[PDB]
From a paper:
Both ANKS6 and ANKS3 have a similar domain structure, with ankyrin repeats at the N-terminus and a SAM domain at the C-terminus. SAM domains consist of approximately 70 amino acids and adopt a globular structure generally containing a core of five α-helices. Here we define the ANKS6/ANKS3 interaction by discovering that the ANKS6 SAM domain binds to the SAM domain of ANKS3.
These proteins formed a heterodimer when analyzed by SEC-MALS and yielded crystals suitable for structure determination. The ANKS3-SAM/ANKS6-SAM heterodimer crystallized in space group C2221 with four molecules (2 ANKS3-SAM I36E mutants and 2 ANKS6-SAMs) per asymmetric unit. Additionally, the overall structure of ANKS3-SAM I36E aligns well with ANKS6-SAM (RMSD across backbone atoms is 0.626 Å) with the only obvious difference being a 1.6 Å outward shift of ANKS6-SAM’s helix 3.Similar to the ML-surface of ANKS3-SAM, the ML-surface of ANKS6-SAM contains a shallow hydrophobic patch (residues V30, A34, L38, L46) flanked by negatively charged residues (E29, D31, E33, D42, E45). The ANKS6-SAM structure also shows that the EH-surface is lacking a large hydrophobic residue flanked by positively charged residues, thereby showing that ANKS6-SAM cannot polymerize because its EH-surface is incompatible with binding its ML-surface. Through these interactions, R54 is involved in stapling helices 4 and 5 and in maintaining the overall fold in this segment of the domain.
Numbering used by the authors:
A (entry chain C): 8 to 67
B (entry chain A): 3 to 66
The structure:
Amino acid sequence: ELTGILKKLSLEKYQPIFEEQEVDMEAFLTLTDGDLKELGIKTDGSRQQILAAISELNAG
Amino acid sequence: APYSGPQDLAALLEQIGCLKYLQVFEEQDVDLREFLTLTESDLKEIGITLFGPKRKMTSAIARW
């Protein structure tokens, strides 16, 4: 699930954003770079890692 | 019948786990037909202020 994905990326510091914004897995898998910026994840590397994770999950 | 659209707004919201917003729509007299015409900023203006539910709704609108 989401918390596990962030844990594996060492990005659990962003978990409170997703929780408060009620981003479930369905919504999470639709997130773009622009969406992550809007949610407040301003660090480029953080977005790169999250998007890479999303990409692998959606692959196929 | 399988794979047909939702019969009404409650049905759509149930499908996307957003029934917590049904009464907000009802208070604005937004039924299924009107809901399917809304844009992202329309949803925000009605009170769907959180990213997750608003995204599931814009996805549903595009879907149906």
